[PDB]
Design a protein around this ligand. Sequence first.
Ligand SMILES: *[C@H](CS(=O)(=O)c1ccccc1)[C@H](CCc1ccccc1)NC(=O)[C@H](Cc1ccccc1)NC(=O)N1CCN(CCOC(=O)c2ccc(NC(=N)N)cc2)CC1
Length: 255
Amino acid sequence: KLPASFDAREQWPQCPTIKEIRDQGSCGSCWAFGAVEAISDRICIHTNAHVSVEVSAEDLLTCCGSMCGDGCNGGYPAEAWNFWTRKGLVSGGLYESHVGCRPYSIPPCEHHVNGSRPPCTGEGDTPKCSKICEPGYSPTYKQDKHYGYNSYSVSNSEKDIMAEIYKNGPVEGAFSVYSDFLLYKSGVYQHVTGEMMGGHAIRILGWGVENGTPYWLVANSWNTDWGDNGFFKILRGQDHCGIESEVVAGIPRTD
Ligand SMILES: *[C@H](CS(=O)(=O)c1ccccc1)[C@H](CCc1ccccc1)NC(=O)[C@H](Cc1ccccc1)NC(=O)N1CCN(CCOC(=O)c2ccc(NC(=N)N)cc2)CC1
């Protein structure tokens, strides 16, 4: 039934947010980016590319409050999807993109790689929840809200997670980062060395096999010069680093 490989970017070629890699900046907002990326993809999938919007990481980061966690100090993916069904999320693109209602306000940075941007630091104060759209944005903040029908956990089962992506689109997941992960360039990541750094929340958008090693296709939010153009592959089928244990998703409401 299920194909040996699947790639959401190939299944939905008219949904450009699936290909897009974000940058959370010097802020611990991975929990929010995993959600809003997967939500942006599912809205485009749900509407067969008639609605293709970047949902605002800023709106979720600043307006969820204690229910999600503590903003730029980290949070909880399951509770971010719940906020999408309760208060909804407005649109907004990348830092200084002037795209959408509330584009990201935290500037980009270099995540364990060399580049022209400033290196990422630990300067994460959560910006204020400003329920106003960017000047000149036509819909009001209320009208630009996109709502979820539901949110739910996917079971810790390889086949259920694949089936969920295959039918409903990309999901949010979470796994434990060990220090050898920071140096990922290519291939299928498997933890071999280094201490535990913390939990990280990402967007899973497919699967495959590389040199006999089954993997998940994952979007990171550390900009494009990290890893494999911003994506990585991680070992699939063994709950490696907990990758199969914290998967969450949800279905958009229409309009
Ligand atoms: C995104 C992952 S990441 O930024 O790319 C990263 C990867 C490796 C190492 C460090 C960061 C965020 C990062 C949060 C964070 C945690 C500690 C220090 C800095 C940043 N990760 C999360 O949001 C995860 C999501 C998750 C949920 C469930 C299962 C797995 C993963 N949540 C998380 O880590 N939490 C929950 C919220 N907590 C908030 C409490 O805040 C703090 O204690 C805190 C103190 C100090 C800092 N440092 C700075 N502000 N510079 C951050 C947070 C924390 C734990």
